[PDB]
Amino acid sequence: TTEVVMENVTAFWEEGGTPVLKDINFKIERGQLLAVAGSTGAGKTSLLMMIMGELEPSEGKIKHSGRISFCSQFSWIMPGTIKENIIFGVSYDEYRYRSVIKACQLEEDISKFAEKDNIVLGEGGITLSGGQRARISLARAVYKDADLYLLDSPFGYLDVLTEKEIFESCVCKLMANKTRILVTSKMEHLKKADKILILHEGSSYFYGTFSELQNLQP
Numbered sequence: 001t002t003e004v005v006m007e008n009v010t011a012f013w014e015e016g017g018t019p020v021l022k023d024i025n026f027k028i029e030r031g032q033l034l035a036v037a038g039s040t041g042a043g044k045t046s047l048l049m050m051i052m053g054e055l056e057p058s059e060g061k062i063k064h065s066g067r068i069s070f071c072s073q074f075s076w077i078m079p080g081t082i083k084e085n086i087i088f089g090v091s092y093d094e095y096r097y098r099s100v101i102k103a104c105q106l107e108e109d110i111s112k113f114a115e116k117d118n119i120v121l122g123e124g125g126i127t128l129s130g131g132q133r134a135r136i137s138l139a140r141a142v143y144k145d146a147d148l149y150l151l152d153s154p155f156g157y158l159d160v161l162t163e164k165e166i167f168e169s170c171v172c173k174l175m176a177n178k179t180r181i182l183v184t185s186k187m188e189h190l191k192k193a194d195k196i197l198i199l200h201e202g203s204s205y206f207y208g209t210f211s212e213l214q215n216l217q218p
């Protein structure tokens, strides 16, 4: 039925501090995509942290079940091959790995190296670009089997067309049956999402659909 719910959620990082989230409400059905938008400091990553149990509500209720795969907004690499970085301790399957690689446009990068998927990262040899590290980090999160994918601004350092292509091939097509929360501000992502939550300084600036928002326009 419903995969993730927040109801009247208020939370604080620090006792007696200012609330980081204020009366937040949303629901995601199984297989849907929630886009979470808002300016820096609005509370988007903190919302993800609450779903992951790192931040408890002071008011309100939260529902979520099952395993989570989390993609940080800060890309990271550990010493090892590009294949090891993407599978990252999960069991290996050639078809699944290849599908993720292709959806993240990493096939083109990998094909250029003599060592192919065995190119070694994070050990002083290859220095990856920001966009390469972001696509590897996204691929790692998408390769993991999970009930809920939390993708925190995963398109760092990508030009707008590459971002659009990967949003479509990875988030929309490859992950079509999966419950997804994507922190993103881009118009097409909000338009393709089943629901949109725009945060501003902890509060719900807007919650609904892109179509509902368009209907409010003069």
Ligand SMILES: Nc1nc2c(ncn2[C@@H]2O[C@H](COP(=O)(O)OP(=O)(O)OP(=O)(O)O)[C@@H](O)[C@H]2O)c(=O)[nH]1
Residues within 6 Å of the ligand: 013, 014, 020, 038, 039, 040, 041, 042, 043, 044, 045, 046, 047, 073
């Ligand atoms: N005390 C404390 N404050 C935090 C922590 N993490 C985030 N914050 C603060 O909580 C507010 C929201 O922060 P975030 O949730 O990281 O904001 P965001 O929407 O993810 O911002 P961007 O990632 O820059 O787009 C901010 O005012 C932060 O200063 C923490 O671990 N401890």
Ligand SMILES: [Mg+2]
Residues within 6 Å of the ligand: 044, 045, 046, 073, 152
């Ligand atoms: Mg953040």
